[PDB]
Amino acid sequence: MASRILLNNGAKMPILGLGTWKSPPGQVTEAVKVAIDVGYRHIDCAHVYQNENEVGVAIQEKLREQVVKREELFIVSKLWCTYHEKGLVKGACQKTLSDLKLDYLDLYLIHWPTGFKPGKEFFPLDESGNVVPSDTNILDTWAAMEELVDEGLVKAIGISNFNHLQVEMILNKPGLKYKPAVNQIECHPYLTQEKLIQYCQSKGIVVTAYSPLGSPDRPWAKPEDPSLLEDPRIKAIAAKHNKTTAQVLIRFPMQRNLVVIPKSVTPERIAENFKVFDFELSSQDMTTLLSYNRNWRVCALLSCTSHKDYPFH
Ligand SMILES: NC(=O)c1ccc[n+]([C@@H]2O[C@H](COP(=O)([O-])OP(=O)(O)OC[C@H]3O[C@@H](n4cnc5c(N)ncnc54)[C@H](OP(=O)(O)O)[C@@H]3O)[C@@H](O)[C@H]2O)c1
């Protein structure tokens, strides 16, 4: 399979990237170094992950070493919810750029449609346990993202965790200057997303699938939750193809014309997870994997369920 997908800004995006949420700061520099050595050319980052400085150390070394050229890398980050105000967006982007050791991002995403009150805390909460919102809306935040393109800080802009009506709101924004290039959403056999994916693809927006392995290291995991990597039905498909369950879970979104961003800090798994361009799932395999949908979310943003822009009602 071809390694890159064409975006609606004219640039090409690698379909397989390395995730970095929960990657410990003392391990993520190695992880990114190994990833680049074994062929990864796309790294998914975010300010809220608190490890962009350490990701950047790896990127800069590999650029300095001439293992890879900057134009061959595709670095993605995300604007956190406490920076949706017009006057904070540029500085948030520039902090991410400084930390990552870059003079531009390939893609910058609005991390969630929900804006929160600015300040030091990433989740300002009230006594109900609900977030303190910002009176920003997705459309003014989008205009601020468009400015970043026009200042040369980012090559592409996009969105994350936007539902169908929120994507449509952006696409229908009065005076829209740049369409979103990407919508990054949770997607795996237990949350298959047929409706939102077809809508985005029909508009030329590329979808990136996050938590493709079901995020077994998510901090709020409960033992009774379903487990993709341990699902016997998925293990059986992997065995038939002489691949690992993770490799099946990564190949699955690729064959739906999605980008996918599995996270690992384990060198062997980083290498294994990239070895997914040597085999094909059948159409029957694809439909079988789709049949496992149960609308189960790793990331439900539960402290924000009363925010006006909460995406998952
Ligand atoms: N936009 C958003 O709101 C949002 C939300 C969630 C995630 N994301 C992005 O998507 C990325 C991926 O999602 P995720 O981190 O939630 O989870 P994930 O990629 O579904 O799963 C990561 C977990 O799987 C393990 N793992 C990796 N490869 C494996 C393999 N071959 N065999 C067995 N276990 C394996 C990792 O362990 P080790 O690391 O110990 O090897 C880690 O515990 C994130 O890191 C982040 O970049 C974005």
Side-chain angles (χ1 to χ4, degrees), residues 3-11 13-26 28-65 67-68 70 72-85 87-116 118-119 121-126 128-163 165-168 170-194 196-221 223-229 231-234 236-267 269-279 281-304:
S3 72
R4 302 201 290 172
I5 188 168
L6 180 62
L7 301 180
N8 65 7
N9 75 335
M13 180 172 185
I15 67 174
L16 177 58
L18 182 72
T20 65
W21 175 38
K22 311 171 263 59
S23 298
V28 72
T29 300
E30 168 176 359
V32 172
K33 287 178 175 179
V34 168
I36 292 171
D37 289 342
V38 305
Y40 292 72
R41 298 292 178 268
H42 165 190
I43 314 295
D44 183 75
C45 309
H47 178 68
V48 77
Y49 301 165
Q50 303 184 222
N51 60 4
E52 294 194 310
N53 191 41
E54 292 88 352
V55 170
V57 173
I59 294 170
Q60 178 57 25
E61 173 180 305
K62 295 294 166 183
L63 292 171
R64 181 194 71 84
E65 288 187 327
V67 176
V68 68
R70 174 66 187 92
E72 301 168 330
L73 291 178
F74 197 98
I75 310 302
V76 183
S77 186
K78 320 187 190 75
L79 179 77
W80 185 247
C81 300
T82 53
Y83 307 93
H84 283 205
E85 280 75 4
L88 300 182
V89 168
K90 190 182 191 182
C93 184
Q94 289 178 313
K95 167 58 168 163
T96 280
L97 286 171
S98 178
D99 286 349
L100 292 172
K101 265 66 70 180
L102 300 177
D103 61 12
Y104 67 92
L105 294 170
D106 296 275
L107 177 64
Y108 197 49
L109 305 177
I110 305 182
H111 202 147
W112 292 85
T114 51
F116 305 167
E121 300 295 351
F122 290 155
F123 281 85
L125 307 182
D126 69 26
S128 237
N130 286 104
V131 76
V132 179
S134 168
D135 66 18
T136 63
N137 61 29
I138 62 182
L139 300 185
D140 292 328
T141 306
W142 188 252
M145 299 288 284
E146 293 175 325
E147 288 200 6
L148 300 175
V149 175
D150 290 330
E151 296 173 307
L153 272 69
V154 311
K155 300 300 188 193
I157 50 174
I159 58 188
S160 183
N161 302 295
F162 280 47
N163 71 32
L165 293 182
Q166 293 169 327
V167 180
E168 187 172 57
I170 298 284
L171 290 177
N172 293 339
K173 177 184 182 297
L176 182 68
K177 191 174 187 184
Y178 302 116
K179 291 177 285 183
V182 166
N183 189 14
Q184 179 180 129
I185 63 177
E186 189 176 336
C187 185
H188 47 68
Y190 299 155
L191 184 70
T192 50
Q193 301 270 30
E194 282 96 327
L196 183 54
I197 287 168
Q198 190 281 337
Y199 178 75
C200 290
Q201 293 183 334
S202 80
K203 300 297 185 181
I205 301 171
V206 165
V207 174
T208 301
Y210 76 67
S211 306
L213 312 180
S215 197
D217 61 339
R218 65 198 182 280
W220 48 81
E224 62 273 17
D225 293 349
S227 164
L228 287 165
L229 288 163
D231 188 320
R233 303 169 296 179
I234 307 180
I237 293 169
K240 180 175 69 179
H241 289 279
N242 303 312
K243 303 296 283 188
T244 70
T245 306
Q247 287 168 330
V248 168
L249 291 166
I250 292 162
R251 183 71 189 200
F252 173 53
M254 295 167 65
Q255 291 188 208
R256 304 175 71 193
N257 301 308
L258 312 177
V259 176
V260 63
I261 54 171
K263 172 268 182 183
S264 181
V265 293
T266 303
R269 291 171 168 177
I270 294 166
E272 162 186 320
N273 290 351
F274 203 74
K275 293 177 182 177
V276 293
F277 301 85
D278 63 349
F279 81 108
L281 297 167
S282 66
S283 172
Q284 181 176 12
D285 287 332
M286 293 295 294
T287 296
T288 299
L289 287 160
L290 286 165
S291 81
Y292 302 154
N293 181 57
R294 49 178 289 163
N295 306 314
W296 178 74
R297 293 182 187 276
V298 169
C299 287
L301 203 73
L302 293 175
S303 66
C304 300

